[PDB]
CSV table of C-alpha atoms in Angstrom, one decimal:
chain,number,residue,atom,x,y,z
A,1,UNK,CA,0.3,-0.9,-16.2
A,2,UNK,CA,-0.1,2.3,-13.5
A,3,UNK,CA,-0.4,3.9,-10.7
A,4,UNK,CA,-3.1,1.6,-8.4
A,5,UNK,CA,-2.9,-1.8,-9.9
A,6,UNK,CA,-2.8,-5.2,-8.3
A,7,UNK,CA,0.9,-6.2,-7.8
A,8,UNK,CA,1.8,-9.6,-6.7
A,9,UNK,CA,4.9,-10.9,-4.5
A,10,UNK,CA,5.5,-14.3,-3.0
A,11,UNK,CA,3.4,-13.6,0.1
A,12,UNK,CA,0.5,-11.0,-1.2
A,13,UNK,CA,-1.8,-8.3,-3.3
A,14,UNK,CA,-0.3,-4.9,-2.3
A,15,UNK,CA,-1.1,-1.9,-5.5
A,16,UNK,CA,1.1,-0.5,-7.5
A,17,UNK,CA,2.2,3.3,-6.7
A,18,UNK,CA,3.9,5.0,-9.3
A,19,UNK,CA,5.9,4.5,-11.9
A,20,UNK,CA,9.1,5.7,-11.7
A,21,UNK,CA,12.7,6.1,-14.0
A,22,UNK,CA,16.5,6.8,-13.6
A,23,UNK,CA,17.8,6.5,-16.8
A,24,UNK,CA,16.6,4.4,-18.9
A,25,UNK,CA,16.1,2.7,-16.1
A,26,UNK,CA,12.0,1.9,-15.3
A,27,UNK,CA,10.9,1.1,-11.8
A,28,UNK,CA,8.1,0.9,-9.4
A,29,UNK,CA,7.4,2.8,-5.8
A,30,UNK,CA,5.2,0.2,-3.8
A,31,UNK,CA,5.1,0.2,0.3
A,32,UNK,CA,8.0,-0.8,2.5
A,33,UNK,CA,6.3,-3.2,4.3
A,34,UNK,CA,4.7,-4.5,0.9
A,35,UNK,CA,8.5,-5.0,-0.5
A,36,UNK,CA,10.0,-5.8,2.2
A,37,UNK,CA,10.8,-10.4,2.0
A,38,UNK,CA,9.9,-10.4,-1.9
A,39,UNK,CA,11.6,-10.2,-4.3
A,40,UNK,CA,9.7,-11.1,-7.3
A,41,UNK,CA,6.2,-9.0,-8.5
A,42,UNK,CA,3.9,-10.4,-10.5
A,43,UNK,CA,0.9,-7.8,-12.4
A,44,UNK,CA,-1.5,-11.0,-12.3
A,45,UNK,CA,-2.1,-13.2,-9.0
A,46,UNK,CA,-1.4,-16.9,-10.9
A,47,UNK,CA,1.5,-15.5,-11.3
A,48,UNK,CA,2.5,-15.9,-15.5
A,49,UNK,CA,3.0,-11.9,-15.7
A,50,UNK,CA,6.8,-11.2,-14.0
A,51,UNK,CA,6.9,-7.4,-13.6
A,52,UNK,CA,10.2,-7.1,-12.4
A,53,UNK,CA,12.6,-7.9,-9.2
A,54,UNK,CA,13.0,-5.9,-5.2
A,55,UNK,CA,16.1,-3.4,-5.5
A,56,UNK,CA,15.2,-1.8,-2.3
A,57,UNK,CA,13.3,-1.9,0.4
A,58,UNK,CA,12.9,0.6,3.8
A,59,UNK,CA,10.1,0.1,6.0
A,60,UNK,CA,9.5,0.7,9.0
A,61,UNK,CA,10.8,3.9,10.0
A,62,UNK,CA,9.9,4.3,6.6
A,63,UNK,CA,7.3,2.7,4.1
A,64,UNK,CA,8.6,2.8,1.2
A,65,UNK,CA,10.5,0.1,-1.4
A,66,UNK,CA,11.1,0.2,-5.5
A,67,UNK,CA,11.6,-2.9,-7.5
A,68,UNK,CA,13.0,-2.4,-10.8
A,69,UNK,CA,11.2,-3.9,-13.8
A,70,UNK,CA,12.7,-7.0,-16.0
A,71,UNK,CA,9.1,-7.5,-17.9
A,72,UNK,CA,10.5,-5.5,-21.3
A,73,UNK,CA,6.7,-5.9,-23.1
A,74,UNK,CA,4.3,-4.8,-20.6
A,75,UNK,CA,3.5,-0.9,-20.9
A,76,UNK,CA,4.6,1.3,-18.1
A,77,UNK,CA,2.2,4.0,-17.5
A,78,UNK,CA,3.4,7.7,-15.8
A,79,UNK,CA,-0.6,7.4,-14.9
A,80,UNK,CA,-2.5,6.6,-11.6
A,81,UNK,CA,-5.8,4.1,-13.3
A,82,UNK,CA,-5.5,7.1,-16.5
A,83,UNK,CA,-5.2,9.7,-14.9
A,84,UNK,CA,-1.6,12.1,-16.0
A,85,UNK,CA,1.1,12.3,-13.2
A,86,UNK,CA,3.4,14.7,-13.8
A,87,UNK,CA,5.3,16.2,-10.9
A,88,UNK,CA,6.1,15.5,-7.5
A,89,UNK,CA,4.5,17.7,-4.3
A,90,UNK,CA,4.7,18.4,-0.6
A,91,UNK,CA,1.4,17.5,1.2
A,92,UNK,CA,0.1,20.8,2.9
A,93,UNK,CA,-2.7,20.3,5.8
A,94,UNK,CA,-5.9,21.0,3.7
A,95,UNK,CA,-4.9,19.6,0.5
A,96,UNK,CA,-7.0,18.0,-1.9
A,97,UNK,CA,-6.1,14.8,-2.7
A,98,UNK,CA,-7.2,11.3,-4.3
A,99,UNK,CA,-6.3,7.8,-3.3
A,100,UNK,CA,-5.9,4.6,-5.8
A,101,UNK,CA,-5.7,0.7,-4.8
A,102,UNK,CA,-6.4,-2.5,-5.9
A,103,UNK,CA,-9.1,-3.5,-3.6
A,104,UNK,CA,-11.1,-0.2,-3.3
A,105,UNK,CA,-10.0,2.7,-6.4
A,106,UNK,CA,-10.4,5.2,-6.4
A,107,UNK,CA,-11.4,7.4,-3.6
A,108,UNK,CA,-10.9,10.9,-1.5
A,109,UNK,CA,-10.3,13.1,1.4
A,110,UNK,CA,-7.8,16.1,2.6
A,111,UNK,CA,-4.9,16.2,4.2
A,112,UNK,CA,-5.4,16.6,7.7
A,113,UNK,CA,-2.0,16.3,9.1
A,114,UNK,CA,2.0,15.8,9.0
A,115,UNK,CA,4.3,14.7,10.4
A,116,UNK,CA,2.3,11.5,11.9
A,117,UNK,CA,4.0,8.7,13.3
A,118,UNK,CA,2.4,5.6,13.0
A,119,UNK,CA,3.0,2.2,15.5
A,120,UNK,CA,1.7,-0.6,13.7
A,121,UNK,CA,2.8,-3.0,16.7
A,122,UNK,CA,6.0,-5.2,17.7
A,123,UNK,CA,8.7,-2.8,16.8
A,124,UNK,CA,7.1,-1.5,13.3
A,125,UNK,CA,6.6,2.3,14.0
A,126,UNK,CA,6.6,5.0,11.1
A,127,UNK,CA,7.3,8.0,10.6
A,128,UNK,CA,6.8,11.1,9.1
A,129,UNK,CA,3.3,10.4,7.7
A,130,UNK,CA,1.3,12.7,6.0
A,131,UNK,CA,-2.9,12.1,7.9
A,132,UNK,CA,-6.2,12.2,5.1
A,133,UNK,CA,-9.4,11.5,5.9
A,134,UNK,CA,-9.6,9.3,3.1
A,135,UNK,CA,-10.4,5.3,3.9
A,136,UNK,CA,-8.1,2.0,2.3
A,137,UNK,CA,-8.6,-1.3,2.6
A,138,UNK,CA,-6.6,-4.5,2.4
A,139,UNK,CA,-4.2,-4.4,-1.3
A,140,UNK,CA,-4.6,-1.2,-1.4
A,141,UNK,CA,-1.1,-0.6,0.8
A,142,UNK,CA,1.4,0.9,-1.7
A,143,UNK,CA,-1.0,3.2,-4.4
A,144,UNK,CA,-0.4,6.2,-4.7
A,145,UNK,CA,-1.8,9.1,-3.3
A,146,UNK,CA,-2.1,12.6,-6.0
A,147,UNK,CA,-3.7,15.7,-6.0
A,148,UNK,CA,-4.8,16.4,-9.7
A,149,UNK,CA,-1.8,15.7,-12.1
A,150,UNK,CA,0.7,15.7,-8.8
A,151,UNK,CA,1.9,12.1,-6.8
A,152,UNK,CA,2.1,13.0,-3.5
A,153,UNK,CA,2.2,9.9,-0.7
A,154,UNK,CA,1.9,6.3,-0.6
A,155,UNK,CA,-0.9,3.9,0.8
A,156,UNK,CA,0.5,2.7,3.9
A,157,UNK,CA,-1.6,2.2,6.2
A,158,UNK,CA,-4.4,3.6,8.6
A,159,UNK,CA,-7.9,2.4,10.6
A,160,UNK,CA,-11.8,2.6,9.8
A,161,UNK,CA,-13.0,1.1,6.6
A,162,UNK,CA,-14.4,2.8,3.4
A,163,UNK,CA,-18.1,2.1,4.4
A,164,UNK,CA,-17.4,3.4,7.6
A,165,UNK,CA,-15.4,6.4,6.5
A,166,UNK,CA,-11.4,5.2,7.8
A,167,UNK,CA,-8.6,7.6,8.5
A,168,UNK,CA,-5.2,6.5,6.0
A,169,UNK,CA,-1.2,7.0,6.2
A,170,UNK,CA,1.1,7.5,3.6
A,171,UNK,CA,4.1,7.6,2.5
A,172,UNK,CA,5.7,11.4,0.9
A,173,UNK,CA,6.4,10.3,-2.1
A,174,UNK,CA,9.4,13.4,-2.3
A,175,UNK,CA,11.0,11.2,0.0
A,176,UNK,CA,10.6,8.3,-1.8
A,177,UNK,CA,12.0,10.2,-4.7
A,178,UNK,CA,15.1,11.6,-3.5
A,179,UNK,CA,16.9,7.8,-1.6
A,180,UNK,CA,16.4,6.5,-5.3
A,181,UNK,CA,17.0,9.3,-7.4
A,182,UNK,CA,14.1,8.3,-9.3
A,183,UNK,CA,11.7,10.6,-10.8
A,184,UNK,CA,8.0,10.2,-11.8
A,185,UNK,CA,7.1,10.8,-15.7
B,1,UNK,CA,-2.6,-16.2,14.3
B,2,UNK,CA,-2.7,-14.8,17.9
B,3,UNK,CA,-4.2,-11.6,18.4
B,4,UNK,CA,-3.1,-10.7,22.2
B,5,UNK,CA,-1.2,-7.8,21.0
B,6,UNK,CA,-4.0,-6.4,19.7
B,7,UNK,CA,-5.5,-3.6,19.2
B,8,UNK,CA,-4.0,-2.1,17.3
B,9,UNK,CA,-5.1,1.5,16.7
B,10,UNK,CA,-3.8,0.6,12.6
B,11,UNK,CA,-3.1,-1.6,10.4
B,12,UNK,CA,-0.8,-2.0,6.9
B,13,UNK,CA,-3.1,-2.6,4.2
B,14,UNK,CA,-1.0,-5.7,2.6
B,15,UNK,CA,-3.7,-8.5,1.3
B,16,UNK,CA,-3.0,-11.8,2.7
B,17,UNK,CA,-6.5,-12.8,3.2
B,18,UNK,CA,-8.1,-15.5,6.4
B,19,UNK,CA,-11.7,-16.8,7.1
B,20,UNK,CA,-13.6,-15.5,9.8
B,21,UNK,CA,-16.5,-18.1,12.1
B,22,UNK,CA,-18.5,-15.2,10.3
B,23,UNK,CA,-18.1,-15.8,6.9
B,24,UNK,CA,-16.5,-12.9,6.3
B,25,UNK,CA,-12.9,-12.4,4.2
B,26,UNK,CA,-10.9,-10.7,6.7
B,27,UNK,CA,-7.3,-8.5,4.5
B,28,UNK,CA,-5.1,-9.2,6.7
B,29,UNK,CA,-4.6,-10.6,10.1
B,30,UNK,CA,-3.8,-6.9,11.6
B,31,UNK,CA,-7.9,-6.6,9.9
B,32,UNK,CA,-9.7,-9.6,12.0
B,33,UNK,CA,-7.2,-9.2,14.8
B,34,UNK,CA,-9.0,-5.8,15.5
B,35,UNK,CA,-12.3,-7.7,14.8
B,36,UNK,CA,-11.4,-10.2,17.2
B,37,UNK,CA,-11.5,-7.6,18.9
B,38,UNK,CA,-14.0,-5.8,18.6
B,39,UNK,CA,-16.0,-8.9,19.0
B,40,UNK,CA,-15.1,-9.4,22.7
B,41,UNK,CA,-13.5,-12.1,21.6
B,42,UNK,CA,-16.7,-13.8,19.8
B,43,UNK,CA,-14.9,-13.7,16.2
B,44,UNK,CA,-12.5,-16.9,15.5
B,45,UNK,CA,-10.5,-17.7,12.6
B,46,UNK,CA,-11.7,-20.3,10.2
B,47,UNK,CA,-9.1,-21.4,8.2
B,48,UNK,CA,-6.3,-19.6,6.2
B,49,UNK,CA,-7.5,-17.8,2.7
B,50,UNK,CA,-10.7,-16.3,1.2
B,51,UNK,CA,-13.7,-17.6,2.7
């Protein structure tokens, strides 16, 4: 399993952001709104292949979560689909980026703003967000935003759609790596 | 599902489908509710889950 692939919790389906590790411990990152209240994660809609269990979750305010792998045989690729990821970086205005998610696949675009505040309502406000002109749709939450072999962010939310065009906000991945003390590989 | 707090400028993108009266599967409530608004209250919920 790699960045962009579906992940299923008790409640719905999200996308795997990035495979990360600390020491000999493998985890994956996804959106915090996805990890909020989820315990176990599976690889398939049938909930037959276990992946692991949530170890952390930060939403709202931020929008990142981490799940610890408990499945021993599943390959945990350090990629996004076939794409190798070798490092993490800070987004910059004008940066060309690509997103991958479980519903819409791969779409590209560019970073249009930094430090955006997005209000999803009912007190769910997130801060510090990367704004882009990449589209995304339900199911794509938590998938990776990357640029070449660099990890940049995790899909959080936005408006519009892939047919007509949209704006998507992403949580900086650097922030998540630092909070959990993990790194991409 | 109540769409009174709608519209919303942004929606999160987890997938928990709802089936609209237009026969379209809406990927989550936020998405469904903004469509209801955009349709000026014409669109309704047929049932939960994919159409």
